[PDB]
RNA sequence: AGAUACCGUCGUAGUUCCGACCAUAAACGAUGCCGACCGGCGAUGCGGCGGCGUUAUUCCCAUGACCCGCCGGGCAGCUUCCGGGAAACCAAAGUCUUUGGGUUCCGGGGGGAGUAUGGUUGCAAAGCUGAAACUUAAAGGAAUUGACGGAAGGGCACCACC
């Protein structure tokens, strides 16, 4: 099965970090992905953006390297996108989706504007781009869908983001500049100081920290 | 006349003088027979080509440790190279040289330190352009 | 920085570092270094405030001395000079030395023929001990440097301002530096002269 | 080449100016 | 493109530099953007200077030195080999070789 | 960041730098916890205790890491000593 | 790069009104000439007699012989 | 993060800054008395002159202006800033 | 030349606060522009300021606190006609949730929810969220 | 092969000068004006200032010439993930979905075209203003791998030469 090369996979298979939290407050790189399976394995659910080939030309017949999109969700707050090249579709569509669950990051989900009941949009208007490719979102009121292309809107999808309006730059033909931005959204949630913050924090011992007395144990 | 020794060789070789270093010596026909016993080479050519590579390399080691191999009768001698220990000359008996505003710096932490005085503030020469 | 005649600035420390010109910079300043650089005198060379050392070197002696396991911090160093020091640190510590060529991604990369994790670096030089300054960022990794009046000041947490071109400096803050974070842990009264001198970690040639 | 080709539609126009000298 | 922020040239905020014919084959470069070289070389050079030593009526002569200043076009500088295409990394270097 | 019933619904609350009051994002890489000890003040022995600090990766990147752990630790009570 | 004053609504609006005609897809739609030359009336359709019958051919990349009438 | 205060500066930091750029805009020249060689009536004269002056007690001249200062020709008392 | 002497001021901070400095000083002062930052410290936004006094005009420094995202300026001065602000604070605002934008008013500067109280419109000034 | 071309000997207009026309150039930094802000560094030009020694004088002195720094305004340079951008690159081409300092000119796929006509300036050459019918699925920018070079740098082979 899975022996680990990294002190977070020999803290982590025996139960003593509990979930994603205190994995993220610490920005604590990922290198194993069995990490996050022993985590989230059920509702991880798979998917296949594109399988895009790529061709490098040779004084000898000219190569070919097939690409794999791939991003992850579970509809409760945690979104990939993981990206391969290889020269068999097979290992690069199985190698897409380690490199999504390693990128995996936390979204934060808010209200419209009226406070009650569970959250259902973006907090705010977040954006981002890669290649030009300008993926806007704008909050929206509760139980009006996903608007979008349909490449962004299951990226948003898998977040649980319900309702979210959006806004696109040109040139969003390339899946890999469309999805990449606006997966670079969403990942810029947890990047506002909005005035619901503000709040002192409090730091709280790194797990390295409390868990070292067994963590040198050969 | 000669070859360069692959890194089959040169691997090979380097293993046996790190491994069997004082069972060694400096003629090849020694070392031809010595080889084999002590390592299963497929042939016989490369075994008079291993031991050529290995009476060389002995050559290369009575002339200044090198940079390849590990040899514990050397390295001991490295450690008491590197462990000496003489009485103190780092503590730099008396009067020893301080600049004219070293001694003001000094004087701002409130210390009576005895040392020397010149004088150097009159420029005449410093980096060039 | 304290209240202690053990901890705050004695004569006989102070004897330490003007024998082995510590004080003595070099001819430039870095914006980032201006707050530890006392006066320029007239043949071109900075003078650094030895007391704002002593606060920096103790203020990064409290920072080794908060790490729970002394295995879990690396000490590394790539000039010649500090090479035989970073190996006696360990020695006297219980730090994971690391001299000679930085085995560039030690701490990325981790199918690796050297890996580790730690949780504190102590580079000798932010000039020439490049690499793990800069493989500091993709794992989260706190920096102790010995900052000279040369050396770029980013990615380190902690700044010891002193001359480190000599092998006299470096090697006595090494011995210096070790001094600081064994005390607090206890080895003696506090109130003795550590029973090994400078010249342990100093740079030497074989000379007789 | 771009301008040699601008000679000859500049050559060209004397041709039409100097055919209105005949009407 | 831009392969040189210099474009080549050496003029920066004035207008045109007088320009000064190719001393190969008189191309009209201005004196900026030609390559300059300054060739000190004795009249009498070394394949023969014992030569005059022996036929020297004086007893002590100094065998003047010969000071042409050389100024070569572009296109008749890369053909003559004093200097070359070089890499786009290589090529920012601007100190004089060793 | 509330509720309905003004509970806090919300995966966590991200730490937030020591100089800028940036949020340390949870994918930042260059951005770190750091401890310093205490001594009782009177034996100089390591009493216990750690002071906590915390850096955007932005800073480090621009070199003034230092220079943000200095002016809190003179602050704080770590370093008083003045030149 | 903008005039975007507060006394400016002329300026913004006359040049608007002339930049518009750049847009050959304003420029055809909006001026006589464009409508002159259609052969319809600018109608949707239009009759005529037949005067002959006549077939023509394909571009480079595909070869046929499209059949076609001169109405 | 480069945070220091631009209102307290050190009273040699505001010599490293033109005329106009510092705390409060003070004039670099300074109001200067002059012994008159030879007499004893005192007059004032500007330190940054850009005219000759000449004395009744000297019948000579007395400051040469040249470039942005004033140069005396003879050593007189010089009292300043009194202002 | 300067025109907007409250467009400098708020991008002068701004590139400030970009920068992660703690405090920032403004070239030009008025009442506009004092009036202004007492908005934001009424809310928290930033530290707590000084304005320096001449005989010219006067220098505000500001000390800078890490709350305020950004902090821009609207130009020309136009109106708010109290149905019209719903529009601008949806598309110029990042959320109704938090944010403010300031307009000036007959009855002094104040950022716009307190204009739906005294219940009022007047010309609009600028934004910070 | 042709050579009304490159190459070589001649040679008119022209080149230079005084007095008027012409108003065009990759007239380029292919990068509007004015105003503010955001990193360091070693130098360069001019002005003023503070400086310890030297050199020109017998005297600090007037002043040069060196040597250390500061301040303003310039021509420009090196480096950095501040930050932009399609990228090559950029302290501006930054402060741009977190868009609004003030203002001028100008572009809307490529071709027909800077053509026809009309107006206008010009002694002439020409300049300024300036369409449509029709045609076409791509024109076009930066980087990446190859191929290729009558492109340079190393090196090997009698299916290559000496
Ligand atoms: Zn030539």
């Known amino acids: ?129 890669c290649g030009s490719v300008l993926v806007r979102l704008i909050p929206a009121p509760r139980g009006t869908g996903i608007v979008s292309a349909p490449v962004p809107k299951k990226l948003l999808m898998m977040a649980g983001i319900d309702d979210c309006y959006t806004s696109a730059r040109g040139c969003t033909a390339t899946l890999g500049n469309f999805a990449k931005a606006t997966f670079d959204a969403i990942s810029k949630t947890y990047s506002y100081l909005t005035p619901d913050l503000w709040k002192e924090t409090v730091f709280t011992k790194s797990p390295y920290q409390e868990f070292t007395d067994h963590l040198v144990k050969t | 006349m000669g070859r360069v020794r692959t890194k089959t060789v040169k691997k090979a070789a380097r293993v046996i003088i790190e491994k069997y270093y004082t069972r060694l010596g400096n003629d090849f026909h020694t070392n031809k027979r010595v080889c084999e016993e002590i390592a299963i080479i497929p042939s016989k050519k490369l075994r008079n080509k291993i031991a050529g590579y290995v009476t060389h390399l002995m050559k290369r080691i009575q002339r200044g440790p090198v940079r390849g191999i590990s040899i514990k009768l050397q390295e001991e001698e490295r450690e008491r190279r590197d462990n000496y220990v003489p009485e103190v000359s780092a503590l730099d008996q008396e009067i020893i040289e301080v600049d004219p505003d070293t001694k003001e710096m000094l004087k701002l932490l409130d210390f009576g330190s005895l040392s020397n005085l010149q004088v150097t503030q009159p420029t005449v020469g410093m980096n060039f352009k | 920085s304290g209240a202690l005649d053990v901890l705050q600035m004695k004569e006989e420390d102070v004897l330490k570092f003007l024998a082995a010109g510590t004080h003595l910079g070099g001819t430039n300043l870095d914006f980032q270094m201006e707050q530890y650089i006392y006066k320029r005198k007239s043949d071109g060379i900075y003078i650094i405030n030895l007391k704002r050392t002593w606060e920096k070197l103790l203020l990064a002696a409290r920072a080794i001395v908060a790490i729970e396991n002394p295995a879990d911090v690396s000490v590394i160093s790539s000039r010649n000079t500090g090479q035989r020091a970073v190996l006696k640190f360990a020695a006297a510590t219980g730090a994971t030395p690391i001299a000679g060529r930085f085995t560039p991604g030690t701490f990325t990369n981790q199918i690796q023929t050297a890996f580790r994790e730690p949780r504190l670096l102590v580079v000798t030089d932010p000039r020439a001990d490049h690499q793990p300054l800069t493989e500091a960022s993709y794992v989260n990794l706190p920096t102790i440097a010995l900052c000279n009046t040369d050396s770029p000041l980013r990615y380190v947490d902690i700044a010891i301002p002193c001359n480190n071109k000599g092998a006299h400096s470096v090697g006595l803050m090494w011995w210096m530096l070790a001094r600081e974070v064994l005390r607090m842990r206890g080895t003696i009264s506090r109130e003795h002269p550590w029973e090994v001198m400078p010249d342990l970690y100093f740079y030497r040639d074989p000379e007789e | 080449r771009a301008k040699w080709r601008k000679k000859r539609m500049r050559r060209l126009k004397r041709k039409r100016r100097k055919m209105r000298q005949r009407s | 493109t831009k392969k040189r922020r210099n474009n080549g040239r050496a003029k920066k905020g004035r207008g045109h530099v007088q320009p000064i014919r190719c001393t190969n084959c008189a191309r009209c470069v201005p004196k900026d953007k030609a390559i300059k070289k300054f060739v000190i070389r004795n009249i009498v050079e070394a394949a023969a200077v014992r030569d005059i030593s022996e036929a020297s009526v004086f007893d002590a002569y100094v065998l003047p030195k010969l000071y042409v200043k050389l100024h070569y076009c572009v296109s008749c500088a890369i053909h003559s080999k004093v200097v070359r295409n070089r890499s786009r990394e290589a090529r920012k270097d601007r100190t004089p070789p060793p | 960041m509330q509720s309905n019933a003004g509970e806090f619904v919300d995966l966590y609350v991200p730490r937030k730098c020591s100089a800028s009051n940036r949020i340390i994002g949870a994918k930042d890489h260059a951005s770190i916890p750091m401890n310093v000890a205490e001594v009782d003040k009177v034996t100089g022995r390591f009493n216990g205790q750690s002071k906590t600090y915390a850096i955007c990766g932005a800073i480090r990147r621009m070199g003034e890491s230092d220079d943000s752990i200095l002016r809190l630790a003179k602050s704080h009570g770590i370093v008083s000593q003045n030149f | 790069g903008k005039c975007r004053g507060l006394r400016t609504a002329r300026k913004l609006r006359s040049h608007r009104r002339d930049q518009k005609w750049h847009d050959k897809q304003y420029k055809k739609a909006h001026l006589g000439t464009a409508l002159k030359a259609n052969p319809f009336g600018g109608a949707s359709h239009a009759k005529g007699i037949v005067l002959e019958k006549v077939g023509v051919e394909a571009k480079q990349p595909n070869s046929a012989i499209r059949k076609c009438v001169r109405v | 993060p480069l945070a220091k205060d631009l209102l307290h500066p050190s009273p040699e930091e505001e010599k490293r800054k033109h005329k106009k750029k510092r705390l409060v805009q003070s004039p670099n020249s300074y109001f200067m008395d002059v012994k008159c060689p030879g007499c004893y009536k005192i007059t004032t004269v500007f330190s940054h002159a850009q005219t000759v002056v000449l004395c009744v007690g000297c019948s000579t001249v007395l400051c040469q202006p040249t470039g942005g200062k004033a140069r005396l020709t003879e050593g007189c008392s010089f009292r300043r800033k009194q202002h | 030349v300067r025109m907007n002497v409250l467009a400098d001021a708020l991008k002068s901070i701004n590139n400030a606060e970009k920068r992660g400095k703690r405090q920032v000083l403004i070239r030009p002062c008025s009442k506009v522009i004092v009036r202004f930052l007492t908005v934001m410290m009424k809310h928290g936004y930033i530290g707590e300021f000084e304005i320096i006094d001449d005989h010219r005009a006067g220098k505000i420094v500001v000390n800078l606190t890490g709350r305020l995202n950004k902090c821009g300026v609207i130009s020309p001065r136009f109106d708010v006609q109290l149905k019209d602000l719903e529009k601008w604070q949806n598309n110029l605002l990042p959320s109704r949730q938090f944010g403010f934008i300031v307009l000036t008013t007959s009855a002094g500067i104040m950022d716009h929810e307190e204009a739906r109280r005294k219940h009022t419109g007047g010309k609009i000034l600028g934004f910070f969220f």
């Not at chain 1, 985590?39 to 097939?66: C, H, N, W, Y």
């Not at chain 1, 509809?75 to 897409?96: D, F, M, P, Q």
């Open chain 1, 1 to 129: 099965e899975w022996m680990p090369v990294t002190k977070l996979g020999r803290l982590m298979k025996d139960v003593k970090i509990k979930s994603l939290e205190e994995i993220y407050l610490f920005s604590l790189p990922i290198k194993e992905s069995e990490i996050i399976d022993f985590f989230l394995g059920a509702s991880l659910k798979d998917e296949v953006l594109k399988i895009m080939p790529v061709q490098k030309q040779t004084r000898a017949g000219q190569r070919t390297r097939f690409k794999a999109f791939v991003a992850i969700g579970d509809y409760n707050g945690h979104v990939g996108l993981g990206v391969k090249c290889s020269k068999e579709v097979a290992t690069a569509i199985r190698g897409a989706i380690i490199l999504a669950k390693l990128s995996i990051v936390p979204v934060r989900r808010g209200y419209w504007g009226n406070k009650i009941g569970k959250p259902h949009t973006v907090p705010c208007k977040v954006t981002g781009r």
